[PDB]
């Protein structure tokens, strides 16, 4: 049978049902491509793959059977589907399993930074002792009123639709920004929408990422787009590192241009507090790029992402795929 390799990861128990009859399954639990086997590379008519590992021109390259890389996610900016495209090579992902999950960790985020929950239990983690009203309004300083605040969000897509839903509910005014949607498509949703990302961090007391990262998008937030924020306004970042120059915003939080930020995803990962620009930023809140997951999510996207494989093997390349992002 064809060869199927998971690259970057070991556990293949939800796929083997599926594609039992179709494929050969092996995995090299690689963290690059100099981790994945001979036998891959010469062989592997199919791959999947998750967000940890990247796959250059020179990686595709490698392959000598390779004909699809189904990515178990969403997002396959690491991956150069164009020289994949180039080299006879279907890519395709998993857009819908993590909406839900990734919305509501951006929800969690954004009340966690005008809540300050995560901090006020980190205080009570320290001694801190809380006992006058006095002292509850210093430990809990910053902790904000939602209503009337503008909630900004840049790309207005699958999850940036899901919280602009759930926003709407704490009484966000919300603005949205996203140069690739056609007009209208803010009237059916009842939301505002804005022309420019100057405009959207002028206006913004909250702003969120919620925009695949392409080749024009890199550090859409750095020096000259964080000056365009509003004084104390909030970043929360799900969407991908690289989206944001940690520089400029370890700045912004260590000057205070920047009240906090809540990061999901990061410029180099896996994310660690000791090392990289956010070293010591203050009012920093950050999880190991975990937002889209819930058990269930994870079994969808892998059985959808085994079908997807399945379709390719016994199907046409790219007729018989379901999401080939081409
Ligand atoms: N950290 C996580 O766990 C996790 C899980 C799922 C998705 N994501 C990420 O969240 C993002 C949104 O995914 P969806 O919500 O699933 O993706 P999507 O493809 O449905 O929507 C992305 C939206 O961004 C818009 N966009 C692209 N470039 C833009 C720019 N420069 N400015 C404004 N808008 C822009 C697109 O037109 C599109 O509407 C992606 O980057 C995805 O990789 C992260």
């Not at 890519?91 to 809540?115: G, M």
């Not at 804005?194 to 024009?216: I, W």
């Not at 020096?223 to 940690?246: C, H, I």
């Amino acid at each position: 049978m064809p060869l199927v390799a998971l690259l970057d990861g070991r556990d293949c128990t939800v796929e083997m049902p599926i594609l039992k009859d179709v494929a050969t399954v092996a995995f090299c639990d690689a963290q690059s491509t100099q981790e994945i086997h001979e036998k891959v590379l010469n062989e592997a008519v199919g791959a999947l793959m998750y967000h940890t590992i990247t796959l250059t021109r020179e990686d595709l390259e490698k392959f000598k059977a390779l004909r699809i890389i189904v990515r178990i996610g969403s997002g396959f900016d690491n991956i150069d589907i164009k020289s994949a495209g180039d080299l006879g090579i279907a890519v395709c992902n998993v857009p819908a399993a993590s909406v839900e999950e990734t919305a509501d960790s951006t929800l969690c985020h954004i009340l966690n930074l005008y809540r300050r929950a995560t901090w006020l239990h980190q205080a009570l983690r320290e001694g801190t002792r809380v006992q006058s009203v006095e002292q509850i309004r210093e430990v809990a300083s910053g902790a904000a009123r939602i209503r009337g605040e503008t909630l900004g969000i840049i790309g207005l897509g699958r999850v940036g639709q899901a919280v602009a839903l759930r926003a709407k509910a704490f009484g966000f005014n919300v603005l949205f920004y996203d140069p690739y949607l056609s007009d209208g498509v803010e009237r059916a949703l009842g939301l505002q929408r804005v022309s420019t990302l100057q405009d959207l961090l002028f206006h913004s007391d909250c702003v969120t990422l919620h925009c695949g990262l392409n080749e024009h998008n890199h550090h859409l937030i750095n020096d000259f787009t964080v000056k365009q924020m509003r004084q104390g306004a909030f970043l929360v970042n799900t969407a991908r590192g690289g989206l944001v120059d940690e520089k400029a915003l370890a700045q912004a939080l260590k000057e205070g241009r920047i009240r906090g930020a809540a990061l999901d995803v990061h410029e180099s990962e896996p994310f660690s507090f000791s090392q990289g620009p956010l070293k010591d930023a203050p009012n920093l809140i950050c999880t190991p790029h975990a937002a889209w997951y819930s058990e269930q999510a994870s079994i969808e996207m892998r059985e959808e992402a085994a079908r997807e494989i399945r379709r390719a093997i016994t199907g046409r390349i790219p007729d018989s795929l379901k999401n080939c992002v081409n």
